[PDB]
């Protein structure tokens, strides 16, 4: 009885804007029939990878993938947004000691400057930043709510806060 399958998204963002694409893939079970469940309803998709093109809020929700008589995977919650700024996260629940990366993602990959992430109101400093993202080794301290800010065109926006937990 091979252990249970696992879903991975490419990109890793489980929070995406309306109109973006994301691919879901069911994990490695053997070297060597797929069944996708969207919000718990068997999908007409049977291939190993589920492609979500031009995301629609309707695509938000839970997802599971299962091989025949091998118990289903752990649920993955996707969520489509519509806003100027969106704080994307590698994962919302991180196992202490693992990597945590964030991303102040602008709509249509718009140029955002003066970016600044914050953990519980306070700015986070010294994360490995790169216009693309910021990373850090997970700590039980890193737990808390996040949200970034940045200037677009000439204005300063702020994203919807986000709740991240580092299970010690
Ligand atoms: C699987 O199950 C999940 C639940 O976990 C469902 O997810 C919900 O899906 C609905 C849409 O079906 C989402 O609600 C929609 O929100 C839109 C925008 O949200 C508001 O907030 C943002 C952020 O502040 C604003 O940008 C935005 O303007 C809104 O203020 C609404 O626009 C939608 O209704 C309106 O727009 C649509 C399309 O334009 C019109 O058709 C409507 O008439 C109306 O004018 C809608 O309310 C909800 O947020 C989702 N929940 C979560 C947590 O993501 C999945 O949809 C479901 N999928 C299936 C197939 O079962
Ligand atoms: C991420 O951090 C963990 C734990 O780091 C500890 O706390 C830091 C502040 C610093 O004081 C470190 O020296 C501490 O060890 C790293 O540790 C690994 O943790 C796993 C279990 O959690 C353990 O089995 C490994 O043996 C640990 N390895 C080491 C070198 O201690 C973890 O490796 C770090 N990951 C990266 C790449 O940063
Ligand atoms: C999401 O992926 C789709 C393809 O799956 C992209 O849509 C293509 O867009 C080009 C022009 O931009 C068209 O010529 C193609 O016909 C489209 N493909 C399909 C299958 O319709 C889309 O651009 C991607 N969106 C993002 C945000 O990258
Ligand atoms: C994000 O995390 C914060 C803090 O961990 C949560 O807010 C706290 O909620 C408790 C009650 O559950 C309040 O007594 C505290 O005052 C709140 N703290 C702050 C700083 O506001 C919040 O619930 C989490 N967000 C979500 C959606 O779970």
Instruction: Give this entry's resolution in angstroms.
Output: 3.2
Query: Token pair for residue 56?
Result: 């629609």
Which of the listed residues 34, 51, 81 is the one where a domain comes to its end?
Answer: 81
Reduce the DSSP state of residue 75 to 3 states and report it. Answer: coil
**Ligand 4 pocket test target in 92, 143, 163 with most atoms within 8 Å of CB:** 163
Q: Are residues 60 and 101 in the same domain?
A: no
Distance CA 85, CA 24 (A): 24
Distance CA 15, CA 21 (A): 11
- Specify the residue with its C-alpha closest to ligand 1, atom 23: 82
Residue 167 Cβ < 6 Å to ligand 3: no
Distance CA 26, CA 29 (A): 9
Atom of ligand 1 nearest to the CA of 41: 61
Backbone angles phi, psi at 155, to 5 degrees: -105, 165
Distance 125 CA to ligand 3 centre (A): 37
Identify the nearest ligand to the CA of 52 by its number.
Answer: 3
Q: Are residues 38 and 103 in the same domain?
A: no
Atom of ligand 2 nearest to the CA of 96: 22
- Specify the residue with its C-alpha closest to ligand 1, atom 29: 82
Distance 91 CA to ligand 4 centre (A): 18
Method: X-ray
Residue 29 Cβ < 6 Å to ligand 2: no
Question: CA torsion angle for 161, 145, 129, 55 (degrees, to 10)?
Answer: -40
Nearest to 107 by CA among 89, 131, 82: 82
Q: Which residues constitute the domain of residue 40?
A: 4-81
Q: Are residues 76 and 110 in the same domain?
A: no
Q: Gaps after which residues in the chain, C–N over 2.5 Å? A: 32
Q: What's the angle, vertex CA 108, arms to CA 107 and CA 110, rounded to 5?
A: 70
Distance CA 82, CA 87 (A): 12
Which domain CATH number covers 113?
A: 2.60.40.10
- 62's torsion region: left (phi>0), alpha (psi -120 to 50) or beta? beta
Tell me how far the alpha carbon of residue 151 is from its chain's centroid. Answer: 23
For residue 142, the 8-state DSSP code is S
Q: Are residues 102 and 58 in the same domain?
A: no
Q: Are residues 127 and 146 in the same domain?
A: yes
């Amino acid at each position: 009885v091979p252990q249970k399958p696992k879903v991975s998204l490419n990109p890793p963002w489980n929070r995406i804007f309306k109109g973006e694409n994301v691919t879901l893939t069911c994990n490695g079970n053997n070297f060597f029939s797929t069944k996708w469940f969207h919000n718990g309803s068997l999908s007409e998709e049977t291939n190993s990878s589920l492609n979500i093109v031009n995301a629609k809020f309707e695509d938000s929700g839970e997802y599971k993938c299962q091989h025949q008589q091998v118990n289903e995977s752990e649920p993955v919650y996707l969520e489509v947004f519509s806003d100027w700024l969106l704080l994307q996260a590698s994962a919302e629940v991180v196992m202490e000691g693992q990597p945590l990366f964030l991303r102040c993602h602008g709509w249509r990959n718009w140029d955002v400057y003066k970016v600044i992430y914050y953990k519980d109101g306070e700015a986070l400093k010294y994360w490995y930043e790169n216009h693309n993202i910021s990373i850090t080794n997970a700590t039980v301290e890193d737990s808390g709510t996040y949200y970034c800010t940045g200037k677009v065109w000439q204005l300063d926006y702020e994203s919807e806060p986000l709740n991240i937990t580092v299970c010690k």
